[PDB]
């Protein structure tokens, strides 16, 4: 159902909450990954650190925070909860 | 009012006393204060004979 | 007029009846301390409030007061306890005291419209309150007009004396509303004493006109009039019916400064020739010129510090010089535009009066023709109010079988809690007055016309009507007029005896399944406007003592994030969002600059610092002889610096 | 299927307005089709209107002309009621020069070659012995309602004062359907449109421009 | 910075997650963003040039503005901010005009009427801030009120009347179904819902008719589904029912999996439906379902034919009351002398007044058909000081957060749960709880087991078993050393699921109690401050019989103990302090039995009295009982867990009698109990909040001077434990995303996705 | 005059169901032709359908049909879903007679040359044990949806289109964000494709609106070109 999510509401938070423990863990999850993607796109980030991404097919002008949400939705990355 | 437009009134009654000058609340006091000769005409239809 | 006659009650009852109405007390917390004087109230020389009345029914009128309250036996007239603002609400007896109170405040909030069309249905106070307000041109002595011009009007009296009246033309009021006077007479006319020679800003033909007459539909229309919102026809924007002129004054001054006296000049330190193109030889904006956000009004320079290396190099390379100077120009405030109507300049060369040390003073007046726009607050005389939800093109609107679209579309759901019955009454009488009527008496007059006079019958279209507050019309006579409606051009009747009509949806074309109440209601344009109430800020100036942003100046006011908002932000559990607002968006000296830098480069936004509010807190404690120390896990004490 | 092609036949009630009747066609088509033309008539009819005007004595809209009774801001509102027609393919300027006591009407305006004033009887301003009024009106093509085109957008320096332009030859359009013979014999509807104009063009030529607009629209 | 405000207008065409943003407001708000992308392209050579390009509104930037605006959330807020739903996130839409277009559903959450109101906009900047707006504060994710649990986005005022008209049924309608006769067959049947539409368009069908049609993509009522199929659902299978076309079009807005309803939609019926939709479906389905109910509700409100006029309003009553008034006038010819009777008088007046009211009620419904616009609206169900108390509520409970999943404590509190021979307070007290023990039926079979969400389906399932009382975990009994635990707190009212760890309940509980502040408010502050009741009421100090003695000076209540010890007498009680009310019911009389906790007279009992009598745990039950009863008198719906969070902070302190350590400073229970003579102590929220660990949080609460002097002498060091301290110094609050377990997360892609 | 070019796109949800968009449209052009499109798609497309049917052993009885599990009413609703393309344009009587236990799928009805049955898998009725049914049905072309005339008078669904709905949205920010985007959703029977169904409605409107164009062809109108 929910014929098709539009913009911010995609992906649904229900299908996202299965990838992490809490909604708060979801925030730090996608937020730090957005920092990694936006780094990679500008250029290599901090001292002696090579940053990767994006893993999923990027959108036309898709923001780095919207990409990281699609990455978590597909289980393309795991985090250490706590 | 001489140049008043025609406005049909639904009131079947009559108001004999026209509204006094609503601005008289400010003028009558300052004319009493300065002691204007127009307020000195209040002694024409006099009350207390002295316009102090 | 109601600012005068107002009174402060700080020092309900039977003595308040007929002396000072609590009906026009403000809706704020000061209710009860502030009231307006009654219509017929007279003041005794000792300060006592004397109510007029007729001893019982003797024809003489004596002053009633507490002395007359001892021997109390007939009142002078209705609306004794009703003030001027309240006495101008038709069908006042039907609305609630709250809605009657709000209606008074709504009337004194109206803005003068360019057209100034008189009310179609109203009381008898419009005429009497307009002339006595003082903003209308009244004839002093009977005579004949000698000349009539937009500038002045001359009257040739039979006595032989010559009186002339200069008309206020587009004069800026105290709150910025254009005060304009229109001559209503011609040269050949013969005017009697006390007659209206010219209309004021909000008057037409000698009576207060605070709004316009518009065709209304009370059907809810696809949620665009939801809960308070009102939908308008694009006709009102095209025909400038709700358009109003607004004028604002700007001022700037000259020398007597800190490091010396500065001069106002056209020359700006470094700008393009096209930026000052609208500035004159002195440097003031030329009259009649259009100004948008940021444009210079008055050019002015300051004394320099005359004390960067990187800027001097480019200066020496291309030949520009460290001509002092700090640019100090009076620009237009962000978010406003208009045309320059006039400039008043006070110089030092001429001997004029000015403050000590200030050489030159120039004031610029800019006028705006404000079209009605979505978001503007409209209201009627009954206290109803609401923003403009949407402005529909004239093509798609509920329209009568004539093809005549409705101007506004109201909603019904307000009635079954607040009931505001008077709003519906003038809506039907508004249609009765617009289309006229003829009772078509056959074998006498109907029973509803029993208490009526004979002149009320058989009136033509577009006829004004007066219904006094308590002696006015009644429900029976209304429906009788609803049954009599002069048809339109083709002879078809557009409104039944129920005040309803079958409207056609301008979008789908299908007719609306049920008959919808239509009519003419008198609405107002309140001083709250979108152009004044919209604010947006990305970066701007900051206060000196506290490094927080500062709102309330001519540009870029910042929004306040209170603790109540901080409580909601904590309830969501959003720690970062709350930290961003209180440190780098408000008080971080090095934070808000590095964020604007990172945003421009497109980098990550850095971690916030220590808000200046907290650093000021520590010094306030130290000055109180309280030794505070911020200790980490190690390195015992750290100093902010 | 009872097949008889729809037939549009003209009529006349007044000159500025004349009815039109199209019959027959299927049920439910009267209200949806008659309104679709009304929405097109009221908006998209190519018209002729005045874009900006210029008066020698005044620098802006908020002043007064010596001798005249109406202020400039009141004359602009009186000039908003001007109905005009023009081919003009281009911006062209009219002229109005009047002197002495009298009444300045729309007939006193001199239309250049290709344009014409359709309401010479309209009142503009009243002049007296000292009143002298000379103005210049720029007429331009367009449709619908365009607000005043500010000179800050198109440099038309201090002299010209832009005015809201209304290109709408139509005045008032309505319609009513009569579905006859709803019985078991047959089924069909027939409607009549009431089209009114500002005298800029005839009702017949107005409906044609609305018809050609829809014909080229559906694709 | 990066903020603004404007006047709000209705946004009926918006999605729940969208908001209408003026182009100029969005331009100046995103000014640094557009300048960057404008410099990324060659429109402007350098950043200094792009600034003038944005400030002068060159038309080249508007295409760039929609890119930086897309998928970049903004926060909307309307002052005053009462609860957390007063701030929500939306998706900005560039809109012509200077006003703000607000979705018509969030108006109740913002309490935003459309008369001259204004709302403020804030632009989140950091990736963390944008994530918290898209996940925590999104408009569509916040539907249920986090006080009672009911949905706040439920349609209202026009969408109620619009849906009421669509689903209502009128007999004798144009397309009414007629049973088959010997001459012709059934005429009310249609092949599909599509045909009925084609029949509705023509003059053959009324949307409110009683026709019966065949539905394929729509699932049937659960009662009739078992009879018809019993073999499974029917995605493509067909079936026939008798409804109204509107009820058919209404059920298409609901999810396909949801069964058919076939009722005219009341305000309570719609609320009943949205509740069950929220549980059984993800909120995206509930968000889009209510969004579909908005379009239809607004659409049919216009076609509803609701309009006001003289007829539908004008008052019959004239002749009625002119007659009744003369009866009261003639009663003066009787009250004077001869027929007063001094109690027939008052009884005559009350009966005659109510008789006129009864005749007026009949006349109210005697002059209008049931389709009257005002009557239709009524039937459908469409129609400042508090901030002081709220700040103290927030000041005492701001530090209460969930810190662990389970404390594994075995003891909760008893819930009344369904008197029968059905308690209306179970939805507030029993709902969204967690069982401490299993629910055992007398027959031996066990039903809902301990540690269960105690959903509404469980209450009905428990009601079928016929069990009266259940024991439920609570924060009052939570043994967590820090804050509370998820299991004791239970289901989050907003999420509908188990409360998350980061959740800060104390503030949510404080706002939930503070917002209704707008037998009243002065009484509520009396309880939370733990003061002595205005009129003190006696409580039984022991169990036994009672001797009622009535004297002029005052009542006398003597309790004869069942133990046989010294009698307990309660003397000098004002006679106007009426006696307390009680298989056989009635009012307390002489000789009744009274237990230890019974209140002897009507009124308020001293909270300090019951503390030393029944114990600290019975005090918290009594306090919440009286607090809940006040808000219930006004019709407010607050879950008991919110009040229980505030009451939990009062009894946390114990008074050490004397010397080992020294005198009766109000200490902490856990700090005292977990390390090795003291008392349980009840104290007000203002005194309790000042006793918290940190000094510069208590300094901002009340009378900074006294707090600082004591904190200066003792050299009290603030560990920055609470969230107020971190707000003051700009740190990350230890709640929600600031919790150590959450903010220390490490994000790295899987090596399986890296190589790909 | 000249106007910015719109776009006519098509998104196919299923074989018989598709939705179309028109972007952009000047305001207000969405509601002008939108309601006229739906009315033109629905009632203006020619098609053949069932007018009246007759079976064996019916006239006397009303509700029950001995020899079949389906009643009279339920049997009518099935044959209402029968899609038939006839170029005869006049009432033609097709015959359908099947005996013995089984299922009548409309593949047993013998179509006269010139008409067809597009859904031979449609379930008309289930035959009773040792039963027989012979139905003669009248089929004639028509337009739109005509109610029953009042043998088996039934409701004739002449148009191939079944469900048509429309709405409008706002896009095309460039300098005026109120430009209209017309959405229209049409569900059609398999007799014709939705893309050809829309063309028939558009072709009927341009010819209908051509009556006004031919009044004065040279009257200045708008053209996208
Ligand atoms: N100090 C962290 C602890 C979070 C946790 O692990 O629960 C916060 O506050
Ligand atoms: Mg409000
Ligand atoms: Zn616990």
Residue numbers in the entry:
A (entry chain E): 25 to 106
B (entry chain C): 23 to 74
C (entry chain C): 440 to 450, 466 to 510, 515 to 531, 570 to 803, 806 to 1139
D (entry chain A): 2 to 220
E (entry chain D): 423 to 737, 740 to 807, 867 to 904, 911 to 1007, 1027 to 1090, 1095 to 1171, 1175 to 1191, 1203 to 1282
F (entry chain B): 2 to 151, 161 to 235
Paper text:
Semisynthetic derivatives of the bacterial natural product rifamycin (e.g., rifampicin or Rif) are components in the first-line treatment of tuberculosis and other gram-positive bacterial infections. Resistance to the rifamycin family of antibiotics commonly occurs in clinical isolates as a result of point mutations in the antibiotic’s target, the DNA-dependent RNA polymerase (RNAP). To study the inhibition of RNAP by Kang-like congeners, we solved X-ray co-crystal structures of Kang A in complex with both wild-type Mycobacterium smegmatis (Msm) RNAP and a RifR RNAP variant carrying the most commonly observed RifR mutation found in Mtb clinical isolates (Msm RNAP βS447L). Our structural analysis revealed that Kang A binds the same site on RNAP as Rif.
While Rif was inactive against an Msm RNAP βS447L mutant (corresponding to Mtb/Sau RNAP β S456L/S486L), all three Kangs displayed potent activity against this mutant. We propose that the additional interactions with RNAP contributed by the unique Kang moieties (K-sugar and K-acid) stabilize the binding of the Kangs sufficiently to overcome the loss of interactions caused by the S447L substitution, leading to an IC90 for the Kangs against this RifR RNAP that is at least two orders of magnitude lower than Rif. To test this hypothesis, we determined the structure of the RifR S447L RNAP in complex with Kang A and compared it to the structures of the wild-type enzyme bound to Rif and to Kang A. The structure was obtained similarly as described for the wild-type enzyme and was refined to 3.45 Å. In the wild-type RNAP, S447(OG) forms a H-bond with Rif/Kang A(O2) and this favorable interaction is lost with the S447L substitution. In addition, substitution of the Ser by the bulkier, branched Leu residue has complex effects on the Rif binding pocket;48 the path of the polypeptide backbone is altered at L447 to accommodate the bulky substitution, and as a consequence the β-subunit loop from residues 451-465 becomes disordered and nearby parts of the antibiotic binding pocket rearrange, resulting in the loss of nonpolar contacts between Kang A and L427, G450, L449, and R456. These structural changes do not affect other RNAP/antibiotic contacts including, importantly, contacts with K-sugar and K-acid. The binding of Kang A to the S447L RNAP results in a reduced buried surface area of 2940 Å2, a loss of 390 Å2 compared with Kang A/wild-type RNAP. Thus, the loss of 390 Å2 of buried surface area with Kang A due to the S447L substitution is more than compensated by the 450 Å2 of buried surface area gained from the K-sugar and K-acid interactions, supporting our hypothesis.
